[PDB]
């Protein structure tokens, strides 16, 4: 079956693992557990198409960026530093893949938190400048999780 090689990147602690575990294991990991490198393979049905999601959950590079087909670039809405770091991930991915239009979704996670420091407007404008979608998520409530991953799969389909 069709396989989608997804890679989740972003600053340490923004919720890359929490988002992935929510999608695949249907629960919120509310504990400290830094990632080195974890892989998740799951058969799913997206828009009627049977496919395999091969998700690489990374640590907060060139090798995995090269094989990845789509990227979720994640930052946390209560961590301005993580938002400012997005540019560096974006540039490295573009360089390694020799492409300025790589399937990608900008993800603003932890949207359940009231202590926001990154305005949705600034993230939206950045995404617009990259020509990619901006989606806010909460690995805690599961809001926007399937949306983020499925949108990424669709971006790959339309590449
Ligand atoms: N309130 C809230 N907390 C979240 C959310 N996503 C993750 N967290 C919390 O943020 C912390 C770090 O999440 P984690 O998934 O481990 O982040 P990571 O990006 O995978 N870290 P690392 O790069 O080191 O692998 C955890 O305490 C986790 O519960 C979210 O949407 N909302
Ligand atoms: Mg992690």
Curated annotation (Swiss-Prot):
Q: Which UniProt keywords apply?
A: Acetylation, Cell membrane, Cytoplasm, Disease variant, Glycoprotein, Golgi apparatus, GTP-binding, Hydrolase, Isopeptide bond, Lipoprotein, Membrane, Methylation, Nucleotide-binding, Nucleus, Palmitate, Prenylation, Proto-oncogene, S-nitrosylation, Ubl conjugation
What results from changing residue 12 to D?
In CSTLO; severe mutation
Tissue-wise, where is it found? Widely expressed.
Q: Report the PTM annotation.
A: Palmitoylated by the ZDHHC9-GOLGA7 complex. A continuous cycle of de- and re-palmitoylation regulates rapid exchange between plasma membrane and Golgi. S-nitrosylated; critical for redox regulation. Important for stimulating guanine nucleotide exchange. No structural perturbation on nitrosylation.
Gene designation per UniProt: HRAS
Tell me the impact of changing residue 35 to S: Loss of interaction with PLCE1
Positions of post-translational N-acetylthreonine modification: 2
What is a GO molecular function of this protein? Answer: GTP binding
State the function annotated in the UniProt record: Involved in the activation of Ras protein signal transduction. Ras proteins bind GDP/GTP and possess intrinsic GTPase activity.
Residue ranges the record marks as coiled coil: none
Tell me the classification of the organism that encodes this protein.
Eukaryota, Metazoa, Chordata, Craniata, Vertebrata
The entry's stated outcome for residue 12 to S is:
In CSTLO and CMEMS; also found in patients with oral squamous cell carcinoma
Organism listed in the record: Homo sapiens (Human)
Q: What is this protein called?
A: GTPase HRas
């Amino acid at each position: 079956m069709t396989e989608y090689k997804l890679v989740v990147v972003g600053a340490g602690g923004v919720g890359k693992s929490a988002l992935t575990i929510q999608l695949i294991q249907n629960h919120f990991v509310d504990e400290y557990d830094p990632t080195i490198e974890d892989s998740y393979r799951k058969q799913v049905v997206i828009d009627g198409e049977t496919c395999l999601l091969d998700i690489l959950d990374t640590a907060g590079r060139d090798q995995y960026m090269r094989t990845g087909e789509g990227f979720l670039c994640v930052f946390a809405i209560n961590n301005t530093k993580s938002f400012e770091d997005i540019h560096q991930y974006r540039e490295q991915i573009k360089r390694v893949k020799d492409s300025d239009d790589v399937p990608m979704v900008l993800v603003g996670n932890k949207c359940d938190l009231a202590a926001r420091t990154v305005e949705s407007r600034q993230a939206q404008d950045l995404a617009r400048s990259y020509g990619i979608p901006y989606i806010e998520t909460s690995a805690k409530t599961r809001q926007g999780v399937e949306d983020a991953f499925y949108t990424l799969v669709r971006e790959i389909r339309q590449h």
